[PDB]
């Protein structure tokens, strides 16, 4: 069929779309009385800006510990378990949304985070020495 190209769905626009379709639009969610006017209206917005900047820097630091530095779609060296609700890759990447995939591994996220952060990157950079 005919077409032009991509579209701008929104900030959280790809929620509900399939797993492979939302994997191409990670850019749009990673990019996002004069004295009285400068004491209550001028400090709360500044606090919100500082909070957003500091939250982004600490989460990007948590990405940087895993060895991904500043990439969006990163790759690592950890074997995927036969447990943790393993299916074939076609049903994972063509049928389920990201919300159901996060609800399915809601119990098992901390084990994966400990496998990424500890005993892999320290092990790999031990092997580099």
């Amino acid at each position, epitope marked *: 069929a005919v077409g032009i190209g991509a579209v701008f769905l*929104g900030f959280l626009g790809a929620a509900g779309s399939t797993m492979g379709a939302a994997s191409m639009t990670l850019t749009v969610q990673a990019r996002n009385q004069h004295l009285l006017k400068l004491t209550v209206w001028g400090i709360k917005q500044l606090q919100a800006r500082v909070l957003a900047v500091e939250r982004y820097l600490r989460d990007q630091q948590l990405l940087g510990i895993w060895g991904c530095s500043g990439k969006l779609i990163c790759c690592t060296n950890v074997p995927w378990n036969s447990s943790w609700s393993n299916r074939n890759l076609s049903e994972i990447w063509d049928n389920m949304t990201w919300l159901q995939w996060d609800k399915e591994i809601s119990n098992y996220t901390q084990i994966i985070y400990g496998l990424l952060e500890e005993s892999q990157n320290q092990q790999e950079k031990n092997e580099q020495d």
Partner: nanobody
Framework: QEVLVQSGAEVKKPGASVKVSCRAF????????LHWVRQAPGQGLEWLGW????????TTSQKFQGRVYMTRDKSINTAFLDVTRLTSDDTGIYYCARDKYYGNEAVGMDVWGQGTSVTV
């Protein structure tokens, strides 16, 4: 709840230019492409062209170049159709249509406006 609101009935003399509008409600405007479809009285429906509301790219068929123009406005979520060089064959109704737009390709037309009547 997803609807398209068009302009009223326009009356016109031949040779000049006319502008109609289509405003989207119930969905995000920069997500789906918009088709423009004409119907003559007593005949079938006829297709003009279609515009991506995000990139600003327009596509028109091989027999309305320089006669049919297509613009957008993302601030007020509107699509403007400019029809120039009006003849006696152009009396009819205008439809703005939302493409379903599955996998970045044309699939079908699901949402249609109430229509705009033009008489020349």
């Amino acid at each position: 709840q997803e609807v398209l609101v068009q302009s009223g009935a326009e009356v016109k003399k031949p040779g000049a230019s006319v502008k109609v509008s289509c405003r989207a409600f119930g969905y995000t405007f920069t997500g789906n492409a918009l088709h423009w479809v004409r119907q003559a009285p007593g005949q079938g429906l006829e297709w003009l062209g279609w515009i991506n509301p995000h990139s600003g790219d327009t596509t028109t068929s091989q027999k309305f170049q320089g006669r049919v123009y297509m613009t957008r406005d993302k601030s007020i979520n509107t699509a403007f159709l400019d029809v120039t060089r009006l003849t006696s064959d152009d009396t009819g109704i205008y439809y703005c249509a939302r493409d379903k737009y599955y996998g970045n390709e044309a699939v079908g037309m699901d949402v249609w406006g109430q229509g705009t009547s033009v008489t020349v």
